[PDB]
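Q: For a teaching session next week I want to show students how multiple molecules come together into a single three-dimensional assembly. I've collected the sequence lines for a complex. Could you give me the predicted structure tokens for the whole thing so I can convert them for display?
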Amino acid sequence: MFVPCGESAPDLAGFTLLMPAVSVGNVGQLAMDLIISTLNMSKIGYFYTDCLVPMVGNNPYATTEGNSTELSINAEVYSLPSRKLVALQLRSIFIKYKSKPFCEKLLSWVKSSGCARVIVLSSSHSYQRNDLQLRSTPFRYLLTPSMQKSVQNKIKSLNWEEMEKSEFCIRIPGGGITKTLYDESCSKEIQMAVLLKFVSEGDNIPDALGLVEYLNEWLQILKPLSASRWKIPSSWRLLFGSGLPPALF
Amino acid sequence: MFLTRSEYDRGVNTFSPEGRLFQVEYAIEAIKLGSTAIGIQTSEGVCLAVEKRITSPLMEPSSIEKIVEIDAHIGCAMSGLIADAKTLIDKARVETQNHWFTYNETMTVESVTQAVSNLALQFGEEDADPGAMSRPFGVALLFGGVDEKGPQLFHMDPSGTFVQCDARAIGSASEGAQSSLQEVYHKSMTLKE
Amino acid sequence: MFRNQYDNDVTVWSPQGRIHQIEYAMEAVKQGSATVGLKSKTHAVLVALKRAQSELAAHQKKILHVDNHIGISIAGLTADARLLCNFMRQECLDSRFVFDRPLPVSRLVSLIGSKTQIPTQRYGRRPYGVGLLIAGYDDMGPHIFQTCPSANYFDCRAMSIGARSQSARTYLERHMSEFMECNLNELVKHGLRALRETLPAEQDLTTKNVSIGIVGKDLEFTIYDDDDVSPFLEGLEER
Amino acid sequence: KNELLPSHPLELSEKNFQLNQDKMNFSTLRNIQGLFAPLKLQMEFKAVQQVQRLPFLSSSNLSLDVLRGNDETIGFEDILNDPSQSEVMGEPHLMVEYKLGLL
Amino acid sequence: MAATFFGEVVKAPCRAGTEDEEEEEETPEDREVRLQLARKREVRLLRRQTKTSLEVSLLEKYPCSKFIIAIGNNAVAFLSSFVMNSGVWEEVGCAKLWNEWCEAFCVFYHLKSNPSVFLCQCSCYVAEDQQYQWLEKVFGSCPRKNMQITILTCRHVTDYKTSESTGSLPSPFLRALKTQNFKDSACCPLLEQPNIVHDLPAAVLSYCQVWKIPAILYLCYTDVMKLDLITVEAFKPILSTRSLKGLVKNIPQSTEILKKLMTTNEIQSNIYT
Amino acid sequence: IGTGYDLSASTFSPDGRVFQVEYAMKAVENSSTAIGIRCKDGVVFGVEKLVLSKLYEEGSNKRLFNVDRHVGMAVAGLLADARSLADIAREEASNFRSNFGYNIPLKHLADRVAMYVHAYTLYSAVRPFGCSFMLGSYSVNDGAQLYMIDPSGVSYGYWGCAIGKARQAAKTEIEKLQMKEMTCRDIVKEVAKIIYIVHDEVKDKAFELELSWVGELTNGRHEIVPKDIREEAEKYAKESLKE
Amino acid sequence: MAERGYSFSLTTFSPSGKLVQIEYALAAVAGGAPSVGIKAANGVVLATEKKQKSILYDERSVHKVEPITKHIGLVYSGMGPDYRVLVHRARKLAQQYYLVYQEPIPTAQLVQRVASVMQEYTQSGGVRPFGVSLLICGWNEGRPYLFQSDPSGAYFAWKATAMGKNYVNGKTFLEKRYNEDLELEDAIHTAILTLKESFEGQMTEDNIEVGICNEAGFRRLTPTEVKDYLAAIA
Amino acid sequence: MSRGSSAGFDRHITIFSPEGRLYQVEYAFKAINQGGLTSVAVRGKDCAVIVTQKKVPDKLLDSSTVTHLFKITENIGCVMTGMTADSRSQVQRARYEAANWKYKYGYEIPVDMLCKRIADISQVYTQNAEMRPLGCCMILIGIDEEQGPQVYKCDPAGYYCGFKATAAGVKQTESTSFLEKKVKKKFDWTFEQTVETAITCLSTVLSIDFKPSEIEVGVVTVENPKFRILTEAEIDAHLVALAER
Amino acid sequence: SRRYDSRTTIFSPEGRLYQVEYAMEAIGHAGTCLGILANDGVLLAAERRNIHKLLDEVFFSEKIYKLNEDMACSVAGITSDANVLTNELRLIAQRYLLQYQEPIPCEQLVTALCDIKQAYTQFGGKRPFGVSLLYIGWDKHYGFQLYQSDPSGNYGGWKATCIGNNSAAAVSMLKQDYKEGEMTLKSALALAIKVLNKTMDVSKLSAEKVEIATLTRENGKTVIRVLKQKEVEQLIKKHEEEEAKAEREKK
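A: Of course. Below is the structure for the complete assembly, covering every listed component.
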């Protein structure tokens, strides 16, 4: 389920897993790309699996010339030992009846590695939103019962808004795999946190910036509150593609 | 870096990034779902041959009509959706009779095919209040007839383009039948051959 | 990536301020076969590279009659092309019925522009994915007009549209001065050379795949095919 | 057919009274206001009429009346004969197909 | 996104494909038909010669040192024109699959002189859920990490993303994408950063990268795709380099004539003349 | 940012912005600069018409339209929408002459066309026009009048304005130009100078300058600048750019 | 059971068989200004509260209680403009009935016609139901009448009811207070008390609007008469 | 709608919220605020005055054409706040309706009836799906034959109420509070008194002292029922009077 | 399913119109409406549903609706849709009378209304009529008849059927206690009272929770009258006495 880049097979005991749960508009993927680019996180392995559709291309974070010519895949995992953060990066879409196998594989991998506090950066639909949620902040958080109490008190001090679950079924209209991820994580009894935001489809870079700031409010991996806050990947060029034909204008 | 579920296959009036209209191509696929019809154009006449797919012996073989008479000198072989074929055949017959009434002469096979094609391109472009062809026709026709120019064989496609063909095959086995035809067909072949 | 929402419809403006359906219609017309249209000081010639679906199937015609002095070169969607040709024929007939004079080419092109603009603004309609090279003769002389799937039209001395038309356009731009002042046969040969430049090096022009339409001062629009284009092909230089 | 020829000279005028009134209003706006007002009102009328009951059921056309300024005006048209009390109603599907332009 | 009538409530499609899963998330009949579809879609790797189903993977059965894979009509046409006539290539195995979207076949060849060198002419399309099954059937689970894989495919200029417009771009241009282990010269400009490949070539290249197999992917972007001679002409630089240098003999003359044969026998677009 | 509110022209964003109109404005901004300066004698137009290919005949895709004997029209943004709106304005002016017997005032025509554009932006069935244009005319009673219409549907008179890529630079040049005291000849020379200054030869390979004016010297009749005066203006612009 | 797609559409039935948009319109009604209608033996009173945001409001400019004809009046809770449109339609229908039959339209028939209009608007897909419920009063055949037309088009004949905010409490208060043989000029006091229960602050002549209907006909009470009634009841 | 009804509760005009609110009307109000200006109208016992801030953005822009004070008929004038194009469309519709009323009924339309018609059209807009509410606000003034001066403000939702002192724009709440304070203190409310009240209210809420060119004032008095636009010199004189006292 | 249930015209993969089923569920949410056919005559016994003390009953039929002289009907579903459907029924009956100068047969009117409902269910953009109607009438061809209509547009002639709340239990009870051929008007009323008493579990019937209308033929004229509250009270008392006697006999 997890193949290291070489033969190192890094251990992730006591680390913190980060993933971009496939959101409405890949807001989680954009936020994870921002985090990886800002923290200069190197790929330690590949999360090769049948569930994610295949893709290839040059690494999003070209930076130098040598690093520019490195080939990336659909699911590459980056890690840096300084902050004890391991960041998985899904770069593709899911296949039908393939979310549950991926969730099971990821939960097994994180349990075996030893990492705790799986951060699930996701997003929900902004139109399947209640009036109270409409007038309130779009950001929501979800905590598993097994999650350590100290961080729960930290977030309570931060005064965040818990995701409204309705009897008490916790349904995320736009999470994608987030709901079943939460269910299976609760079944497996491992610490995990879900960070979502009510978004729509379109230009979602502001949504990704808001999500990374929301994550910062808890993790505090960067300064509290600016210019070049989060470094954007070099591959975020041409969000639309091609150019303007000359005949029209 | 992230894949997208960009879809352009649903709208008939939607262009793909390469300019392809996917609904027309799916109509072509519907043609590919039909039975094989073979039409050969020679100097001694035209030959339209199609296969009857008889699901059960109880069904009358004569009821499965796929080669019809547009006019005394025009015939048509269909392949694809049967009812669309029926509508197109009715249009062709009405057009031929109108031409005879107006000009007191037989309508050219090319003219009949052109009229049927003009009917077979009104998907989101008829601009007429009456209910038009919302979806492209799902049948391909082989208008094989003999006129003053001699034997003729025209192939009509769901897109609405009619092209004169010396020997054409349309249906499930269209490609193999076409290969066999081009392997065997020669200009100076007889009708019996 | 972020343009999926604005890509589906023609009435939806993209954040960059560009409708993608029109550009996709332009891609559709590009995907069609190649035509070359050039005019001298007295003649306008349209040479087209006809394509055959199969060896047995006859080459599909790409030069269509419009009036005694106007003709078009087909490129792109065939159904939209036929609709436009019918509209232009009706307009020319109406002009000759009311004013009893040939319809000027520019007026017809303006009418086509308005007609093809109408759908791009309304819902439930798609742009005409057909490009036309219109050759005609008026009191002003020969005319070559390029019509794009976008309603805007262009007035040209020589133009090529379709697949692999960049080489033809380069060749035309190389010898524009020669085009302006040359004999009719020389102009037809220039158009044929441009069409050949469109073709691959291995391939060559044949009577089956070449269609020529010529309109001049005393010459009405006549379409030459096969044995009729053989005289023009004869004498052409080796690539 | 002879039905095309009006039986009464006033019949043709009052049969299309609403259509003629709308045409006159459009002509006046277009003379004075410009092309925008008639086009705007035409789209508005089309939008309101597009949503209503099916042909075999009598519609209220409240929004259409408000837009046309007849919400507070009563003429012989409204009182003399009631579209609700038609006394003649065709097949539902037939009427729907007729409105759709199929027949 | 229906808009069938006036008041129809339309929903914006999600580029991530979430809505499909949301609708998806049983009845025994539904499960039965779903399994029927699953076994209808799965790739069945077998050989028409002797009709012996290939349960064992191709890589396990024969040891390969150079696997050239061509996806798309133009790529297989180029291979058929250049490599077949150079030597002898007999059919060994053929993957059979059924997709919603579609001479569609996936045939594998191996050189009699050097059996270690193999080939694959995948003229058919493979759905997003079947590339991994195809990799399982062909490569198996245990790779060799000693294989020179040259993946050949043709794409459209519209797919390529750059500041210049699609029309302004020189249509017959090709790019390359190689794995970390593949240290040989790419002979082609590397793909631009925002550009992505999401088809069978991408699956094979990702498989090679994950398992440390030296491989290179070539993408020939072209405006036309139906048996075009310019596409194979632009592919020629690939054989001009190593790997395919020895497989193709010094007889371009026959290949040039052979390449014309494939282009002459082509089907034009009825819709677009 | 109206992520889920920018698909239809009949949908309001939470902050109250119709993003389709703004996207139409951006589409207008995508086009080359077209400037027009109003002076005491009349109004002079000028457009940086980029030539896409040398094959095109001189005058193709003209950006200056004569919607009436006395009214000019310099357009920007999408060309097709520009032609459509020019036809609409022509019908309006024709209708005014036919009904009231005298030439339509510039302000009234501008109001009519602007309201047409706004009506198009109102509904969801149609999309807002992607073009912006300048209506200019001169009359003995009305005097020199210049108007500009935005895809939103506004109609504001100007002493000088620009629409297109380098809108702000041309606007600054016109601001530092004292149009109210110069004649039509000096105004056309300065218009050519400004067009040459704002043109970016790097991004845009080449362009052809189209100049038209309406004023007392033309007897209140819109017409293209004569070739001699146009060449003189181009020479003056070249000299100014060189220094 | 989110049922979001079912709630978005009007013509779409919920799996349980509930029209969610109609319920949302009813919620809009419940969020409107309270209005109380009491059918006494001598007559029927329609009392409502017109919450004026600021003192710079012209009381004569608009009226929550409007006459339909010489003997029928109505009050509303919910959206104002919808109420005005429905008032215009009701007046037109009443005048059409008078022209056709040369008789004042009975209250029941007017209520049925208005309810038919509401049903027509709540049936077709493309528009929204009228987010307003009308308390219609009248006097026909020497008998008072009180009706309530819901957004869905279901009309019920009440002896005493309240709508708008705190309508459940108002109905309970009316149940405690309303009497079978109660007469006018006392049902007015009962309605004023119900408004007091549903009012936040002090009720002045301009903060409420009271309209009565009796044998003479429908009549909106002048501010002076409202002030005298308020003084009498407190 | 031809394109199709939107999904979310706040994404379409017709469909209701769980409370039953229509978010598109509220967004139209937000658009009115987005207009960027503030308009103040004051009703006296002798005249009605409308004052709005005039902001000519660019010097090249002709200040004469920049105006939000439009006359519907010879005796009724209005000040529009919000989108310029929508305000112009509403002005044209009001002019047409007033002319039609004069033609059909033989006497000039009252202000209240004009706003009633406008609000009915606005309600029609808010009920159907194809159209959208106009993002602008109409404040009508005029002298009635019997009721004297009348001030009516006329909103997208379809509310046509009349006011003794109307405010609209970005600073609507603060202007309303100031006008309520002034009304609570009942002065004589003469013509110049009403003009001073409007101008000082606008200056207080905008925290700026206007020069003659920063505001446009339109007045209509009982003695002179014709809608009159105050000349810049008269506005300057009023400002000087305010400064002196 | 969350799909194939949006446009009222999407066929499910198994060939199901879920919107019609949801309309039938809405019918099930409505109050109990019962109709029994007897040789002497046919009757309709329907639950009044609304019982609020402040509610007033100014009409003679809370939910019963007389279509013409020879016909009557009862409603269980959406009230406003029911009102429009009853208006259409009256219009169609009067149109038939005008054209043929004879009372419309019951089946013809039921078929016309069902055609209207099926048309509404066939064309997209129109909400199906969520009303189920029970018809009682007499004609010269088949005499007394009882008909039941559905939102889908399907009718059927029944001898004893119930629609609305607890329809299945009422149907089972009718099947248990119906004697085809020997059922009289009085025994039919007793059976209806028993079925209503058992179905409505709130409490014993008080003659204000139910509404009974009987259709009979007297002197060649169809008589449609609504039983007075006192008569319903007497019937309830008789049913209670019968139940008490049966319980005492059981011991």
